[PDB]
RNA sequence: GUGAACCGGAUUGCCGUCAGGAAAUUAGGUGCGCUUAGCAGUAUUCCCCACGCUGUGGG
């Protein structure tokens, strides 16, 4: 079975007061870490019932869950929705017990058993990371002059199109190229949002040796994280019920640890 | 093992009954925070592993 969970954030109100929930969404790494803190081990929960001990990733279960962040929901109020799809039951009352300021509504969870027959029309929403891997010559310095270096870099960069092609056509072709393998066939696809997603990651770096021995003194260095994001919505038709269920709960692209793979399907 | 050694200033006691700081006070007169900007139609996306001469998988 699948577990589907929904979280709500205000992202509104008085701008002259602290808003930890709205500020929490400025870094995708922080969002991923906070969502990962919702799956504690059976020993950590017994030892620390209040989540008041130092946080170590080795004490939390590893499981490839997926999530997406949606915005602009109305009713005279602003809302940001976080939708999480997982293969395990989340523990929201352990993750947000000391951070109830973050949310504007209690978390909700439910079961999900999608059974689809062959040749069924579905309405889908999903966000992609438009990335391709290429060999790039290394240009450096640019101190008024460009100096080339002989090394060729294997780098994952953004998807590009020609001057006579619209981004929508390029993305539709790029998705229809792989849609045979995933297990569905498109009928219409339109691009809604195209942009970037940013984040920062801490990394330990050694500085000096310990006089008493047994380790170093260490410090933190921050590494940037940039991704190309494109949101799509449209209609699809199931080819075979076997590969489609594998496409779900797995992702349809890269950067799946930063909310970049999730298929949302409605029966039309 | 020294004008040194042995060596208690000790026993008893309430400072209690008395007291209005009180009559009177406007802190008022004058003042633009103003000149400025796509979260988007791109030409390298920070790191690692495997298969090829771009496609999978992890942060």
- Of the candidates A94, A93, A33, A42, the one whose C-alpha atom is nearest the C-alpha of residue A67 is A33
Cβ of A67 near strand B (distance < 7 A): no
Nucleotide nearest to A64 (CA to C1'): B58
Find and give the residue nearest to B41, measured CA to C1'.
A167
The answer to whether the beta carbons of residues A111 and A117 sit under 8 Å apart is no
Rounded to whole angstroms, the distance from the CA of residue A15 to the C1' of nucleotide B30 is: 35
Give the count of alpha carbons within 13 A of A117, CB side only. 2
A209 DSSP 8-state letter: B
Query: Does nucleic acid strand B have an atom less than 7 angstroms from the CB of A162?
Result: yes
Nucleotide nearest to A156 (CA to C1'): B45
Query: Which nucleotide is nearest, taking the CA of residue A132 and each C1'?
Result: B54
Q: Which two tokens stand for residue A229?
A: 């994001």
A182 Cβ contact list (under 8 Å, min separation 6) = A243, A244, A247, A252
- The answer to whether the beta carbon of residue A215 comes closer than 7 angstroms to any atom of strand B is no
φ/ψ of residue A168, rounded to 5: -65, -45
C-alpha span between A260 and A226 (Å, rounded) = 12
Query: How many Å does it take to go from CA A203 to C1' B1?
Result: 80
For strands A131-141 and A146-158, give the pairing.
antiparallel
Nucleotide nearest to A160 (CA to C1'): B42
A13's CB contacts (< 8 A; 6+ apart) are A19
Structure tokens at A206: 């050694």
Task: Judge whether A155 and A136 are in contact, CB under 8 Å.
Answer: yes
A250 is near strand B: CB distance < 7 Å: yes
Protein residue closest to B43, using CA and C1':
A160
Bases of strand B lying below 7 A from some protein CB: 39-48, 52-59
State which residues between 69 and 128 of chain A bring their CB within 7 Å of strand B.
none
Q: Is A119 helix (H, G, I), strand (E, B) or coil?
A: coil
| Cβ–Cβ under 8 Å, residues A233 and A124 | yes
Distance A17 CA to B28 C1' (A): 37
Nearest nucleotide by C1' from A164 CA? B41
Entry resolution in angstroms? 2.5
Q: Is the CB of A258 under 7 A from strand B?
A: yes
CA angle A251, A255, A258 (to 5 degrees): 100
Query: Residues A81-108, buried b or exposed e (16+ Cβ, 10 A)?
Result: ebbbbbeeebebebbbeeeeebbbeebe
DSSP letter for A151, please: E
Q: What's the half-sphere exposure (Cβ side, CA atoms, 13 Å) at A86? A: 21
Residue with tokens 């909310």: A259
A28 CA, B59 C1': Å apart: 12
Method: cryo-EM
């Amino acid at each position: 079975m699948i577990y589907l969970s929904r979280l709500l954030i205000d992202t509104g109100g008085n701008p002259d007061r602290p808003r930890p929930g709205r500020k929490w969404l400025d870094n995708i790494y922080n969002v991923h870490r906070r969502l990962s803190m919702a799956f504690p081990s059976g020993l950590r929960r017994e030892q620390d019932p209040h989540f008041l001990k130092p946080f170590s990733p080795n004490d939390f279960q590893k499981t490839p869950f997926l999530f997406r962040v949606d915005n602009n929901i109305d009713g005279n109020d602003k809302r940001a929705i976080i939708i999480v799809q997982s293969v395990l039951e989340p523990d929201w009352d352990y993750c947000f017990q000391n951070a109830l300021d973050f949310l504007a509504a209690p978390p909700e969870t439910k079961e999900y058993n999608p059974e689809f027959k062959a040749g069924q029309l579905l309405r889908f929403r999903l966000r992609v990371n438009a990335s391709v891997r290429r060999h790039i010559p290394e240009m450096v310095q640019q101190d008024g002059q460009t100096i080339e270096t002989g090394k060729i870099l294997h780098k994952r960069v953004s998807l590009t199109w020609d001057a006579s092609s619209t981004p929508d056509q390029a993305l539709a072709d790029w998705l229809a190229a792989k849609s045979p393998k995933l297990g569905f066939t498109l009928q219409r696809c339109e691009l809604l949002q195209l942009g970037w997603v940013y984040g920062s990651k801490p990394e330990p770096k050694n500085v000096k040796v310990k006089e008493q021995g047994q380790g170093y003194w260490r410090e933190h260095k921050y590494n940037p994280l940039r991704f190309r994001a494109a949101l799509l919505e449209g209609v699809l038709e199931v080819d075979d019920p076997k590969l489609f269920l594998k496409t779900l709960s797995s992702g349809i692209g890269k950067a799946k640890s930063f909310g970049f793979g999730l298929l949302s399907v409605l029966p039309i």
